[PDB]
Design a binder for this molecule. Structure first.
Ligand code: SF4
Ligand code: SF4
Ligand code: SF4
Ligand code: SF4
Ligand code: SF4
Ligand code: SF4
Ligand code: FES
Ligand SMILES: [Ca+2]
Lengths: 142, 575, 907, 144
């Protein structure tokens, strides 16, 4: 039996539309006291920021959860699962394919791009939350 | 507010110091430590110190002695010109007041007279200051390195000394072979302490692992520093928010008790008064961890000097306390749940039924503990008069906690200097009959465990409503739901977790009653997002320093019983 | 000068300054957006509000703006007044109503002035519940991305671009809360100084597009103080590295040289460092096969063949450091050392050096240029070569409006009042080129002519200023009228500036400019002279000396030189490609020490993996003569362990010791600099350019990384989970780590990056200066090698004859481009689209005689080769001339002043 | 600034209208009868002033549209309890010397007088409670 807030294995989650939630903002990497996160930003032709690589060194990780609370997209979360063990320390280094799970985890509904002003596919300018339509300077109305 | 900057000129100790040494003989610093801070010259250190020892309500205890580098400190308005400094924290129990004396030093002349004649507990503190800084204490009998080994070149708390292990060359085992050969040839050069001497010199190594060199008891010399983790140095290389996990590991049984003095001290630099719900939540988690530590001390105490068959049921009760902690915070040990301005989350919605189940469960077990320990004769006969000390010995060696309270000195921090809203609770302070020994200390802890359960009874029935985080711009991090929707809250959260919160240049100081003795945090801000100096006063350091004074005239079995009775852990001692 | 009372305390400040720049100099934090130290005060954002009292007894005063308020004697202000604090919080609150939720995906995040001021006011709670305004974006070209939603309408971008930089294609559109900053339509920003908008804009509207391909936050950067390598001006820069690749180029404040601004070639031309084609290991040829060697093997292998050779010659480079050329000179001897530039380029460079050292006329620094009252530009197309001088000359031309405003008692910081008083009045600026320049919008007169005609106007101005100067017979009355206009403005100036350079390709233009400066010096004027050179260390290589590259090629093809050590030089730019490739095939041993892949390394026998400026240390000497030190940014061996990239001076010194005593010597940087000072007295100042590797700030080494640098236990964890040791620097005072010092008040001149508590943006440079907009607190880095000589020169009497066209022969008129003419930066992929198509420019009468129009591919012959180019039409180009783009792929800069024998339509 | 029936029988001079809390202006007066809702009248006024801002200075360019949006909420009946105290703060911080010219001080002069003399019609707009945030599952909020 584990409580919901248990600080075991670190995963990266997904949007309800099915895209990866991480926007490679590097706040989780800097807020970690042990320095166990390395990542690089990439950008799609759509314009969506996403991580080119995501690397967590689980030999160094102390499972403090400061990365989860730093994340402004709810992408990185700590799950109730302590079942880890390896013969080699090199196999404690997890890449993005070992971390990205198929769903949204603890926060089923939050999508960051719906908040964001930046324009990606499916959300042009004025299609975000509390956002009006763009008015051109050449418009006849004063 | 209780955090605003004060010079404490209305404290009555300054006026009699003015009438004794003149107005030009010292200099008063305005801090947020809560105590007067006075800069004296090193030629007057002993005169000022022995004057405070025979005041009509005298200062009897040297709380802490350590140093600061101060060379890279840019905000130094009002202070005298110093290249290094040594601070002396003194406590008067009868006035319920403290004073801090600061001696300024130059970089070429790191020399100050030793304080050991007045206060005996200063011997280990000056050795640490000699170890971590390069201040020489003239007149010290055995001024050797107490943390690092004896061939370690360099003073690690100097600001030119690199903090990280990666900055040095790795463990290539060039020095491991030499340290192994040195350890294999363990011989006495008559330098490891006083060592006057026919005599059998024996090293015995046993809740923590440390070495002691004993003369067969004619002379005993603890060798510590085997658990030095550089926690104080770590404060210089971490932001105020990201340092919080390191606080939890100063004491393993402490948990959220250990985080409490640090967050309260940071909140004084930030100028944050927290809401009432934060106060009751923090007091709740601290009394849960205090109960867990006390049950561990009573459990382990009954096992070594008695039959351990009935008391093994206490593991199930500690499992219930760990399940309640990881239901609230998330993780069983090292929660790192206290935040600057509040806590990490709100209480989850089923907390009340679990706490009520624990409060219903506990009195039957507690009364079985009282029957098992108060009425027993064998352990009582093996614990009465076993390396005892009194009130004069306690105040000399800086012994606080159940030790000091077992003598007639009624001194708790939760009643004398209320913190975290402890003054709105109904609890009693148990006290002994003037003799501190192994039976009296355990009996006091059983009484404290019952008072802790009374505090938890008031927390469940008078849990108020409102936020779990203060409304203040330095509350780190902000509430997450506002961060996920509002740009100004997102901007504050962005800079706080990355560059760090900016604490303005000041010095804060908090003392709390810990699970074992009094634990404190003395923090200095130079205006940056990291601490300039972090000082952690742990009571176990004083408690382990006190043992050669009391054990002299006893057997090795009495040493093992005395070490098992004192409230010492080596993670606290070495930090 | 003046004394003001702030928040009860009392301070001494300069009376001429306003209250914002007074209080920021004292370390009092006032928030601000629309004010800039370079741009002046306009009063738009209303963020700098303080409460002002009439005297000490007035308890209730009024809110004023400190950027718009003079710091007069007797001023009583309160920054921390409660009503002032509430209003300053409200200004941030009003800006936060329309700001997008974009900080995780904003490239300004962690380096954002709006983020810093929002925290500094203490506004963290949103009350506004209504909709936000949105804007669409524009395409601004390959360098700058556009996101108008983040704009706070501070007007800094338009005030920089139109007023300061004199760009024409950026403006403000709309009205009320719908104001839009940008271009009238999409397209590339035309200004050569567009890239300073990323630092000037306090938000993330204008961001670096070259950095957003490989983005990282500022706290993850590794910084070093460096010098720009793209031309001779010597702008101080702060390059940032992450994961072994150079990421962005930042401006490094230097109050003597560049201050807040860089040019676009410096800011965006760094991509050649990040090429995959660069050599990373030493490579030795074996017939057709190639063998990879380590550092020890390469030195022992090279010195075995070099011991058997009978004569070894050395070819230096103008783009190599002073320590690298000297080490090459020490290895072959000074009798065998050649400079690597052509003889005609060498002759113009030593004459340019002669007038600076022996002319007796002071040569101004780049910021001192803005104080001069008249500017004559002879031959140097200065916007395309030496672009920051053109920015400095625009500010000098605005000095007339500052003089009129000072007479009317308008303060120096009130910029909109000064501009209103001015009304297109300018200090006189006279430029001469072969075609139109980018300074033509502000020039009093432009003279488009061949280079001998530009020199002949220069000698005639000197003869009309002094009777002893030699005269130019044959001047027509139309030109004679204009010469009188220039002479009356020059002689009537209190402080004239004379600008020329080596890029015109004429010895006579440089001779004409020294005659004008001499004639003004005899009149009593405080005259300055400025010469622009070609490369980053052109002036340094000229002070060292040596024979020309043509002499070196002679010693190869006449058999006497058995071996040649080429150092960081692609010889095709300086000499004919067919001659170079033939003469390097006769040599038994050719050794190249270059960081870039060049064409001459195909047949070379040994290549050494030299380091670029990002991976090296050294001293460069700029056009002024200032010796400046550049420091290594990152260790390239840290990430890739097979990388054997060493400094050029470290490779050549070790080779000399293995040649002498068979033992390699990996020397330290201060030993090489000491060796320079002893042998060459003219380079004695380079010792004092920077301190040595034993310099400490109270026992600490200067830090390269910010204190919150991340990923220490995960950066290299994909190769080995065991953390390696941190790279150790024995050459310089800097450490390859964050465990060091970067305090604003630390007693040093070399600042790797600016950061302060509460100031994460480029506005943190105010904490490092003595007064804001002034000099660095403990002095700007860099030292002048030579002082002004006591006595001057004689008048040059070598007046050229007037230019005459010839049938068949076509003179080559040089055209320069900021994004194409420089050797390293044209290999950047972002410069491939910013550079224009290759062309050939013809007079309309000459294209009518040839029978072609715009767009026709025409063929010509240079040195027996054939190049076909499409024709462009140039009305300002005089007949008999032919415009070529210098320094491109195919057109060497040695071609300036050459002749094209044959020209006909391509078939 | 608006004036009442009690403010008649008072001379049309600059300092006489000045001591009555208003400005004499162009001296061309406008009468408001009992059938005009004051909130709608002020909303029309602020809409003109907001859209006629030149856009140079922040408290005019961004402060005045916030006032317009609050008044539109008040006119429709969607006003929240912190709205009227925001209008008071806007009037204080858009006064003389705080903005770049006198446009913004002239804009808030009808607004502050109409709240002072006709607070009951502005208070009638407040029919909805305060909420500017939406619930997020898995995150407990900070309960004030
Ligand atoms: S996991 Fe979260 S904090 Fe880390 S880079 Fe991705 S979005 Fe940013
Ligand atoms: S849980 Fe803590 S140690 Fe582990 S990756 Fe996250 S921040 Fe780093
Ligand atoms: S410009 Fe600054 S405040 Fe705005 S989204 Fe970017 S980082 Fe955040
Ligand atoms: S684009 Fe940037 S610099 Fe220009 S007005 Fe907007 S915020 Fe200011
Ligand atoms: S002017 Fe020259 S040195 Fe300065 S940034 Fe431009 S190219 Fe670099
Ligand atoms: S107050 Fe005046 S200057 Fe400011 S935005 Fe309004 S109209 Fe423009
Ligand atoms: S900075 Fe002074 S009003 Fe904008
Ligand atoms: Ca180096």
């Amino acid at each position: 039996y584990l409580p919901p807030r248990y600080r075991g294995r670190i995963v990266l989650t997904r949007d309800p539309d099915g895209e990866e939630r991480c926007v490679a903002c590097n706040l989780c990497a800097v807020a970690c006291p042990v320095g166990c996160i390395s990542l690089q930003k990439a950008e799609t032709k759509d314009g969506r920021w996403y991580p080119e690589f995501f690397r967590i060194n689980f030999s160094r990780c102390i499972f403090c959860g400061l990365c989860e609370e730093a994340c402004p997209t709810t992408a990185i979360q700590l799950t109730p699962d302590f079942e880890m063990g390896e013969y080699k320390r090199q196999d404690l280094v997890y890449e993005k394919e070992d971390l990205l799970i198929s769903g949204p985890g603890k926060y089923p509904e939050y999508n960051f791009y719906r908040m964001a002003g930046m324009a990606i596919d499916g959300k042009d300018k004025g299609e975000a939350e509390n956002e009006a339509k763009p008015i051109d300077v050449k418009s006849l109305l004063p | 507010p209780a955090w605003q900057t004060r010079d404490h000129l209305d404290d009555p100790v300054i006026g009699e110091l003015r009438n004794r040494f003149g107005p030009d003989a010292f200099t008063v610093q305005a801090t947020r430590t809560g105590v007067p801070v006075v800069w004296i010259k090193r030629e007057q250190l002993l005169e000022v110190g022995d004057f405070l020892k025979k005041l009509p309500k005298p200062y009897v205890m040297l709380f802490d002695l350590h140093g600061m580098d101060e060379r890279l400190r840019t905000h130094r308005e009002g202070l005298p010109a110093a290249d290094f400094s040594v601070f002396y924290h003194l406590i008067s129990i009868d006035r319920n007041r403290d004073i801090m004396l600061k001696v300024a030093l130059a970089e070429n002349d790191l020399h100050v007279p030793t304080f050991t004649k007045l206060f005996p507990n200063a011997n280990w503190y000056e050795r640490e200051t000699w170890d971590l800084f390069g201040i020489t204490f003239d007149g010290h009998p055995n001024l050797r390195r107490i943390m690092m080994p004896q061939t370690w070149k360099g003073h690690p708390l100097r600001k030119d000394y690199p903090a990280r292990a990666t900055e040095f060359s790795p463990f290539e085992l060039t020095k491991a072979k030499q340290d192994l050969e040195m350890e294999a040839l363990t011989f006495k050069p008559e330098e490891w302490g006083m060592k006057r001497g026919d005599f059998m010199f024996l090293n015995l190594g046993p809740h923590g692992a440390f070495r002691i060199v004993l003369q067969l008891i004619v002379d005993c010399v603890p060798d510590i520093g085997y658990h030095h983790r550089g926690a104080e140095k770590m404060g210089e290389r971490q932001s105020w928010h990201s340092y919080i996990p390191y606080t939890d590991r100063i004491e393993y049984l402490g948990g959220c008790v250990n985080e409490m003095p640090y967050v309260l001290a940071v909140e004084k630099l930030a100028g944050i008064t927290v809401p009432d719900r934060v106060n009751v939540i923090r007091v709740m988690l601290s009394e849960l961890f205090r109960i867990n530590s006390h049950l561990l001390y009573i459990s382990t105490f009954i096992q070594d000097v008695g039959a351990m068959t009935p008391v093994f049921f206490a593991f199930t009760d500690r499992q219930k306390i760990y399940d309640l902690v990881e239901a609230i915070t998330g993780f069983r040990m090292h929660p790192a749940w206290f935040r600057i301005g509040g806590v990490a989350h709100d209480l989850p919605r089923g907390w009340d039924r679990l706490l009520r189940e624990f409060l219903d469960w506990m009195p039957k077990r507690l009364a079985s503990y009282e029957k098992a320990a108060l009425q027993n004769t064998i352990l009582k006969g093996r614990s009465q008069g076993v390396a005892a000390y009194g009130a004069k010995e306690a105040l000399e060696w800086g012994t606080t906690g159940a030790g000091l309270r077992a003598t007639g000195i009624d001194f708790d921090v939760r009643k004398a200097r209320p913190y975290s809203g402890y003054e709105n609770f109904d609890f009693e302070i148990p006290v002994g009959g003037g003799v501190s020994d192994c039976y009296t200390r355990v009996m006091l802890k059983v009484e404290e465990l019952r008072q802790s359960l009374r505090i938890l009874e008031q927390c469940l029935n008078n849990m108020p409503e409102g936020p779990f985080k203060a409304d203040h711009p330095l509350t780190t991090p902000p509430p997450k739901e506002r961060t996920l929707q509002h740009i100004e809250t997102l901007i504050t959260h962005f800079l706080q977790v990355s560059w760090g919160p900016v604490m303005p240049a000041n010095e804060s100081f908090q003392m709390i009653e810990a699970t074992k003795g009094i634990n404190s945090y003395y923090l200095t801000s130079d205006g940056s997002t990291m601490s300039y100096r972090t000082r952690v006063r742990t009571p176990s350091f004083a408690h382990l320093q006190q043992i050669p004074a009391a054990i002299r005239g006893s057997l090795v079995s009495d040493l093992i019983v005395y070490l098992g009775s004192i409230d010492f852990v080596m993670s606290d001692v070495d930090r | 000068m003046a004394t003001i009372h702030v928040d009860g305390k009392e301070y001494e400040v300069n009376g001429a300054d306003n209250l914002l720049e007074a209080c920021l100099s004292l370390g009092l934090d006032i928030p601000y957006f629309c004010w800039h130290p370079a741009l002046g005060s306009v009063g738009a954002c209303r963020q700098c509000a303080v409460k002002q009292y009439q005297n000490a007894e007035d308890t209730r005063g009024r809110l004023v703006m400190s950027c718009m308020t003079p710091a007069s004697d007797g001023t009583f202000i309160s920054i921390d007044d409660e009503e002032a604090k509430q209003f300053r919080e409200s200004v941030v609150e009003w800006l936060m109503t329309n700001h997008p939720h974009d900080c995780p995906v904003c490239e300004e995040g962690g380096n954002c002035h709006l983020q810093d001021m929002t925290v500094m006011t203490g506004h963290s709670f949103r009350r506004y519940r209504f909709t936000k305004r949105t804007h669409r974006n524009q395409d601004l070209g390959p360098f700058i991305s556009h996101e108008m939603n983040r704009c706070i309408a501070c007007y800094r971008c338009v005030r920089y671009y139109k007023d300061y930089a004199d760009g024409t294609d950026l403006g403000v559109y709309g009205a009320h809360d719908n104001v839009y900053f940008g271009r009238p339509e999409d397209g590339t920003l035309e200004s050569e100084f567009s890239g300073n908008l990323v630092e000037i804009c306090p938000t993330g509207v204008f961001t670096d597009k070259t950095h957003s391909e490989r983005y990282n936050r500022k706290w993850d950067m590794q910084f070093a103080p460096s010098i720009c390598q793209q031309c001779s001006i010597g702008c101080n820069i702060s390059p940032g590295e992450r994961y072994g690749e150079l990421r962005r180029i930042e401006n490094r404040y230097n109050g003597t040289v560049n201050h807040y601004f860089l040019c676009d070639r410096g800011r965006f031309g760094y991509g050649y460092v990040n090429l995959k084609d660069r050599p990373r290991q030493p490579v030795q040829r074996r017939g057709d096969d190639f063998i990879t060697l380590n550092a020890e093997q390469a030195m022992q292998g090279a010195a075995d063949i070099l011991r058997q050779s009978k004569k070894v010659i050395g070819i230096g480079s103008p783009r190599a450091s002073v320590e690298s050329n000297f080490a090459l000179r020490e290895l072959v001897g000074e009798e065998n050392f050649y400079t690597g530039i052509a003889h005609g380029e060498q002759e113009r460079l030593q004459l340019a050096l002669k007038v600076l050292r022996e002319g007796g006329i002071y040569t101004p620094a780049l910021r001192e240029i803005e104080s001069y009252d008249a500017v004559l530009v002879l031959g140097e197309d200065v916007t395309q070569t030496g672009a920051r001088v053109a920015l400095a000359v625009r500010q000098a031309v605005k000095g007339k409006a500052r003089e009129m405003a000072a007479a009317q008692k308008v303060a120096d910081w009130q910029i909109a009042a000064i501009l209103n008083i001015g009304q297109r009045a300018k200090h006189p600026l006279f430029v001469t080129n072969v075609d139109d320049t980018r300074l033509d919008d502000i020039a009093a007169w432009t003279y488009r002519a061949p280079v001998e005609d530009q020199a002949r106007l220069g000698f005639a101005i000197a003869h009309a200023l002094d009777n002893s100067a030699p005269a130019v017979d044959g001047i027509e009355p139309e030109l004679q009228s204009k010469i009188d206009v220039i002479v009356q403005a020059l002689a009537g100036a209190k402080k004239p500036l004379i600008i020329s350079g080596t890029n015109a390709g004429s010895l006579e233009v440089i001779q004409a400019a020294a005659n004008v400066a001499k004639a003004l010096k005899g009149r009593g004027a405080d005259v300055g002279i400025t010469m622009i050179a070609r490369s980053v260390n052109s002036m340094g290589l000229g002070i060292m000396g040596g024979g020309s590259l043509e002499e070196a090629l002679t010693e190869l093809e006449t058999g006497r030189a058995d071996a040649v050590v080429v150092l960081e030089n692609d010889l095709h730019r300086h000499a004919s490609a067919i001659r170079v490739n033939a003469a390097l095939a006769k040599a038994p041993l050719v050794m190249v020490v270059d960081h870039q892949r060049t064409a001459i390394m195909e047949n070379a026998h040994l290549v050494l993996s030299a380091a670029s400026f990002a991976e090296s240390d050294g001293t460069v000497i700029n056009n002024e003569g200032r010796a400046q030190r550049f420091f290594q940014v990152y260790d390239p061996a840290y990430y890739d362990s097979k990388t054997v990239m060493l400094e050029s001076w470290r490779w050549l010194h070790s080779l000399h010791s293995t040649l002498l005593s068979r033992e390699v010597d990996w020397t330290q940087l201060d030993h090489v600099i000491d060796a320079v000072v002893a042998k060459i007295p003219e380079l004695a100042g380079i010792k004092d350019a920077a301190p040595d590797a034993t310099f400490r700030i109270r026992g600490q080494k200067l830090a390269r990384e910010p204190h919150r640098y991340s990923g220490r236990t995960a950066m290299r964890a994909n190769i080995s989970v065991h953390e390696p040791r941190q790279p150790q620097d024995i050459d310089t005072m800097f450490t390859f780590s964050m465990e060091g010092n970067n305090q604003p008040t630390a007693h040093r001149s070399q600042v790797p990056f600016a950061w302060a508590p509460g100031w994460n943006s480029p506005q943190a440079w105010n904490k490092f200066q003595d007064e804001v907009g002034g000099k660095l607190r403990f002095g700007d880095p860099g030292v002048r090698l030579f002082e002004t000589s006591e006595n001057g020169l004689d008048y040059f009497t070598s007046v050229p004859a007037r230019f005459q066209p010839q049938d068949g022969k076509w003179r080559i008129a040089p055209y320069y481009h900021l994004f194409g003419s420089d050797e390293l930066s044209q290999r950047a992929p972002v410069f491939q689209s910013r550079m224009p198509q290759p062309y050939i420019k013809l007079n309309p009468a000459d294209a009518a005689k040839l029978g072609v129009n715009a767009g026709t591919r025409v063929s010509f012959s240079y040195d027996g080769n054939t190049v076909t180019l499409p024709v462009e039409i140039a009305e300002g180009l005089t007949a008999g001339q032919v415009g070529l783009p210098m320094g491109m792929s195919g057109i060497a800069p040695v071609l300036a002043g050459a002749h094209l024998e044959d020209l006909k339509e391509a078939q | 600034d608006f004036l009442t029936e009690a403010h008649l029988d008072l001379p049309m001079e600059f300092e006489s209208i000045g001591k009555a809390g208003s400005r004499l202006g162009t001296a061309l007066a406008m009468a408001v009868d009992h059938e005009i809702n004051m909130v709608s009248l002020v909303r029309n006024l602020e809409e003109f002033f907001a859209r006629e801002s030149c856009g140079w200075c922040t408290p005019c360019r961004d402060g005045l549209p916030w006032s317009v949006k609050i008044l539109r909420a008040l006119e429709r009946g969607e006003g929240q309890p912190g709205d009227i105290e925001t209008l008071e703060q806007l009037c204080r911080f858009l006064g003389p010397g705080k903005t770049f010219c006198a446009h913004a001080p002239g804009a808030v002069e009808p607004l502050q007088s109409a709240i002072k003399y006709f607070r009951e019609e502005f208070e009638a707009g407040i029919k909805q409670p305060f909420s500017n945030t939406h619930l997020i599952n898995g995150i407990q909020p900070n309960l004030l």
